[PDB]
Write an enzyme that holds these catalytic residues in place. Structure first.
Site, PDB file in Angstrom:
ATOM      1  CE1 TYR A 139      -3.345  -2.755   0.188  1.00 53.48           C
ATOM      2  CE2 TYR A 139      -3.538  -2.376   2.541  1.00 53.48           C
ATOM      3  CZ  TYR A 139      -3.933  -3.035   1.401  1.00 53.48           C
ATOM      4  OH  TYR A 139      -4.960  -3.961   1.491  1.00 53.48           O
ATOM      5  CE  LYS A 185       1.895 -18.345  -2.408  1.00 61.65           C
ATOM      6  NZ  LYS A 185       1.577 -19.683  -1.971  1.00 61.65           N
ATOM      7  CG  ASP A 217      -2.185 -20.438  -0.670  1.00 57.81           C
ATOM      8  OD1 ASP A 217      -1.109 -19.955  -0.308  1.00 57.81           O
ATOM      9  OD2 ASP A 217      -2.254 -21.606  -1.026  1.00 57.81           O
ATOM     10  CG  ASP A 241      -6.903  -4.535   4.634  1.00 56.70           C
ATOM     11  OD1 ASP A 241      -7.765  -4.454   5.501  1.00 56.70           O
ATOM     12  OD2 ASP A 241      -6.744  -3.692   3.766  1.00 56.70           O
ATOM     13  CG  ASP A 245     -11.816  -7.072   5.878  1.00 55.44           C
ATOM     14  OD1 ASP A 245     -11.870  -6.411   6.915  1.00 55.44           O
ATOM     15  OD2 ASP A 245     -11.671  -6.548   4.799  1.00 55.44           O
TER      16      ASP A 245
END
Lengths: 345, 345
Positions: A139, A185, A217, A241, A245
């Site tokens: 970001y 990852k 994942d 993030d 959620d």
């Protein structure tokens, strides 16, 4: 216990006072030395001060030991310059106190597995704290751009950025069930490999906390099939993030969720829900999230973990005993705050 | 209908033949002009040819119209050089045919909402196709690196890469319920903004398909609370990887899932499940995923959508009528293939 109280807009005043009533009740019972002052923030502050985070509130936040934050924002202020919008005051508060880890717990309180999107057997006992790195990652990464041909963005992380969010995870896990899962990852990405090995090194200072690692994942799959398996989860910013959620929908009653932003300066504790202006003054706003924000303040700003647990249980029993409208009951703000205090006594 | 059949290892031979029996039964009934040949791949090919994707299989894949792929891999081959491992042959097959979109459907067949991690009301009617871009994004992005100080990786995408995965989504949506959701992070990232506006431009060629856009962290929430709301979902590579795995747990019976890789060359249709060597030759392997791979071949390699639907219904009724061991029944491979053919007749 020095608290700057920034109630904000809409339901902020109602639900923040409900939280303060729980705090004054524990202060009288335990002699916490509670001291607090109410400061203008958000739209109320734009209207009175012309900006959402005026220097008085900056100073009170600055001089406090914790911020009990309500909710900010409203239509009135949506068309303002970015510079003064409610939403921006929130980024200024964070920046002013260099808060770098956002902490979001998702918990299925006993007896409310009914609200979960997941089957009762899976939802029972879920209680997980997602710790998300706030200040870095893609970001904010450089380089970045877009042309007619392509667009690019950089997920970048330095050893410090990873070290500091990992330590609040470990410290957080110590106060709960002593298990950390760091998510990356690492099997494809260098940033993931780096994250993993810095958290493994950091982990050495915390021998009383177990650490495991999972790929994002795979962790997404786990959070639906067996979320009750986890205690604390820590990851970078965009995955944090995504995963906060994901975990937030598991109780299936988003109104209930509290949040904390922790860092170098004064820590901020707030409800996840917004300002819900449409019901401000009706006395129906569910105070659960603000009351559980106060419990995250006791646990994370003051280390009074056993009192936070005691507030949490009081709220759990009130959700069962007098459910608010969102849980299909009739208990308005005050009635619900009252049965929390009844259990707290 | 020219099919190269690469059954692989472990249960690959059993479940691939079950799929072929469904295809020969539809060929006799409909005159499909089925023509197929069986080629060595994976560990069987390492043992016979010294490499997992030998030139005969390269040629047969090359000359075929679709590949029915079984499962590859086994302990025997795990300690081999990367160069010849089963897992690598799979990346060579993909690369040789320039397959750039991986398609994974997650579906809750009527009557099996019981297997879902989600409550019956939410699981009922789920049927969503996640289309994931395969060849680009951060897994392959430059620049990338790691030092003592930091690690970096680049989520990069060019207009073409986005254009080609968006077209298979649109084309895929046409054969199902005409709704595409493209998922991005356009409200924070340039790559997301770029993705969004290229898919919106691409979308103009497909007036008979509806397009909406969602952010990945919101879409993760949706996939647990109301997954039945979606038809096709398309996104980049790492988010595709996150969201396909999220959607895959929703039926809650991962053994059942088929997959397709589509591109410039010969398309590949395979089960998601691995080679499960431990039960090879016992005649108990559930053929559902291989049979639904054959149905994705009919729909995606040959456009025979109505026959794919007809295979799917046959499988749905057999899952109810003679559940395999994984669904708590006793139907072995052959018994289950038989009641599929009974419904197909």
């Amino acid at each position: 216990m020095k608290v700057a109280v920034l109630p904000g807009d809409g339901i902020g005043p109602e639900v923040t006072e409900a939280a303060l009533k729980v705090l004054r009740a524990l202060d009288e019972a335990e002699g916490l030395g509670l001291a607090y002052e109410v400061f203008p923030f958000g739209g109320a502050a734009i209207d009175a001060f012309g900006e959402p985070f005026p220097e008085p509130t900056r100073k009170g936040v600055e001089e406090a030991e914790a911020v009990l934050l309500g909710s900010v924002g409203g239509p009135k202020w949506d068309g303002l310059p970015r510079k003064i919008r409610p939403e921006t005051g929130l980024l200024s508060l964070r920046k002013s106190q260099d808060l770098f880890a956002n902490l979001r717990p998702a918990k299925v309180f006993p007896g409310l597995e009914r609200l979960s999107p997941l089957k009762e057997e899976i939802a029972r006992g879920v209680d997980v704290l997602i710790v998300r790195e706030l200040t870095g990652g893609i970001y904010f990464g450089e380089p970045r751009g877009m042309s007619e041909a392509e667009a690019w963005n950089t997920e970048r992380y330095s050893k410090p950025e990873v070290e500091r969010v990992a330590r609040v995870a470990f410290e957080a896990a110590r106060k709960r069930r002593k298990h950390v899962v760091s998510v990356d990852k690492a099997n494809v990405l260098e940033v993931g490999e780096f994250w993993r090995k810095t958290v493994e090194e950091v982990g050495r200072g915390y021998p009383d906390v177990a650490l495991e690692h999972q790929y994002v994942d795979a962790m997404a799959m786990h959070l639906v099939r067996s979320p009750a398996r986890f205690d604390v989860v820590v990851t970078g910013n965009i995955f944090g993030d995504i995963l906060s959620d994901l975990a937030s929908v598991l109780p299936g009653s988003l109104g209930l969720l509290p949040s904390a932003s922790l860092g170098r300066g004064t820590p901020v504790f707030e409800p996840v829900h917004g300002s819900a202006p449409d019901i401000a003054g009706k006395g129906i706003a569910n105070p659960t999230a603000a009351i559980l924000s106060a419990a995250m303040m006791l646990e994370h700003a003051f280390g009074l973990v056993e009192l936070a647990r005691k507030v949490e249980d009081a709220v759990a029993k009130a959700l069962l005993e007098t459910p608010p409208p969102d849980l299909g009951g009739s208990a308005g703000t005050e009635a619900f705050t009252a049965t929390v205090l009844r259990h707290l006594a």
